[PDB]
Write a protein that binds this ligand. Sequence first.
Ligand SMILES: OC[C@H]1O[C@H](O[C@H]2[C@H](O)[C@@H](O)[C@@H](O)O[C@@H]2CO)[C@H](O)[C@@H](O)[C@@H]1O
Length: 682
Amino acid sequence: ESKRLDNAALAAGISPNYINAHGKPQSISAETKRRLLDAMHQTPVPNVMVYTSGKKMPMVVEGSGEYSWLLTTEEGTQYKGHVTGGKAFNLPTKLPEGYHTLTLTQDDQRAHCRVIVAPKRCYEPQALLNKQKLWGACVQLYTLRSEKNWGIGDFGDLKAMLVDVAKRGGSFIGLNPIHALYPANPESASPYSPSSRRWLNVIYIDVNAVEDFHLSEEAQAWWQLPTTQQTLQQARDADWVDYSTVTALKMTALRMAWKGFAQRDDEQMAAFRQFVAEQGDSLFWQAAFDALHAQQVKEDEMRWGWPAWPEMYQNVDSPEVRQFCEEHRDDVDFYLWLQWLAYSQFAACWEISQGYEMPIGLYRDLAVGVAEGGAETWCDRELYCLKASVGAPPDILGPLGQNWGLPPMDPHIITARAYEPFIELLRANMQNCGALRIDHVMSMLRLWWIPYGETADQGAYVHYPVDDLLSILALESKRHRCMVIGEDLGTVPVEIVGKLRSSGVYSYKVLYFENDHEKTFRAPKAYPEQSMAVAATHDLPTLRGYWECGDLTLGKTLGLYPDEVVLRGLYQDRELAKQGLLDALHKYGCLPKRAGHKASLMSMTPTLNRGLQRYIADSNSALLGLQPEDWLDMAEPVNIPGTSYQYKNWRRKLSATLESMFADDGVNKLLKDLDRRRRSAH
Ligand SMILES: OC[C@H]1O[C@H](O[C@H]2[C@H](O)[C@@H](O)[C@@H](O)O[C@@H]2CO)[C@H](O)[C@@H](O)[C@@H]1O
């Protein structure tokens, strides 16, 4: 409550208000602004400048007197001239797209500026330039079943599924985030509180494709034990993923393989070592974190992250951490090996995808942040504002807000590092795939920062440099030939809708929500061309779930809808929605005349299941994502928002193996039909 404070909040990028649940402006408190400012950290040319290619590129200069300048391209090319302080000058025409370096010199000293030249648009594959309408499978990798996996779906299931998807006309397989989690705490299974967004989840390693597992005689002996084969059988046959058991199976197997691998002095060792070198420090600190984490839980299972570790292991420059790394070289190497194996197996999937000429092949998903106590915050502390957490404001459909427990990346550090952490984020998630889904793409404009320990309603939007981030996103998308899907559900200001579209970002449409206030559903053909349409997501009921009001009913049982008055409204809302959707299924040719017209009298059938998927398949959406859960007519969800211990999230497997579902007449017929819908959607 002073102008000092308000002025300070604005310069730092804290919006002074927001639109509440009731659609009214709501001002951010003095207290909130103080906490968030305290949560943040603390020239002739700026440290960085972003330009769009094909356009004029002026560089304003400050200071006094004359400067010389030197611009060096990413490719080695040099350009020079001179400039007076106070004036502006244009950089050379037709600068190629990429990362170049400008340096002004006056007498002794020099000021550096990273100069980024970006295309306007993200990459789009030719098929989509040609207005083809494509479909792919959207899977939660961990749910997959097969006759060869070890109780969790993995990279080997991913490879075998690609074939069956390609043969049926599908263009991609999309994945939940496969970001590294916590092999020392295998029950923290959430893909969305990851250790690092750069490295991978080692649990998806297919141990059957690891040659040293097969060449290790100790591994063979262990494998053939009745106690091993039993544990394995139990892990595989269970209908929920046993993360602790599957993890111990794989770590036991890979430790033994690794004893074999380590002795190698051949191509494979060289390639592993060359990978380690090329990835640099970030990879090193990931392995080190995993190795140290493994040690800490041996003392105490409840050492979930570095903030729970002794003081001496919280500071990466502490001598005790240096000592640990020194004294545990072989541990560090092993967790570096797992990352190599994860990356190589994913890369092998990618290649299969491209041998089948899949226009997208693999579709990765980038979660919106990292956990507070993982490897990323361990080794890059100043980038993250540990005194705040990213969430969402209180709204109509959640009128107490959400706190997702992730420390926000400081916007002023992103820019002070010339966008380095954002560049490296994209580099790690655009490799070996055709598309990237960016979770909560609004994050590039703003995040809801909540002061640590406070309720979501104490938060405020903190801004990020959206225009530079979009240009860099498009540049990296183009360099990787990786298209971008921006998950943009709910409230998007019209300005950002336009930016996103003109930046070639594909929008994200969920069938359930695509209806107006009277429950009139948007026609298939009025879906935006530059989008991906899906029926549901991992956060929502499956098709059967939704029709049966299973999300509402299960949710009640788990304590999520205490307020009975509101729950009555939701059930009514669903009955009205189902009716409007049924109406639209009939009206836009998705059902036979025999199908009932009154939703409340109808249960889910193979005919109705198919009609719901036909509806989105018929859409003008360039991309269509189909859940295998829906091909299998499954009722039960894989994640329930706002639960942790109350439901086994990230655990419900598919009801059938890959082998079994692609041998099934119904599944095949269904996929044949939807492939036809897409190709006839014009
Ligand atoms: O990180 C805690 C948070 O994880 C999940 O929420 C995700 C959601 O699954 C994503 O699809 C997207 O909306 O970002 C969310 C924030 O991470 C769980 O669904 C949720 O229960 C939990 O709070």
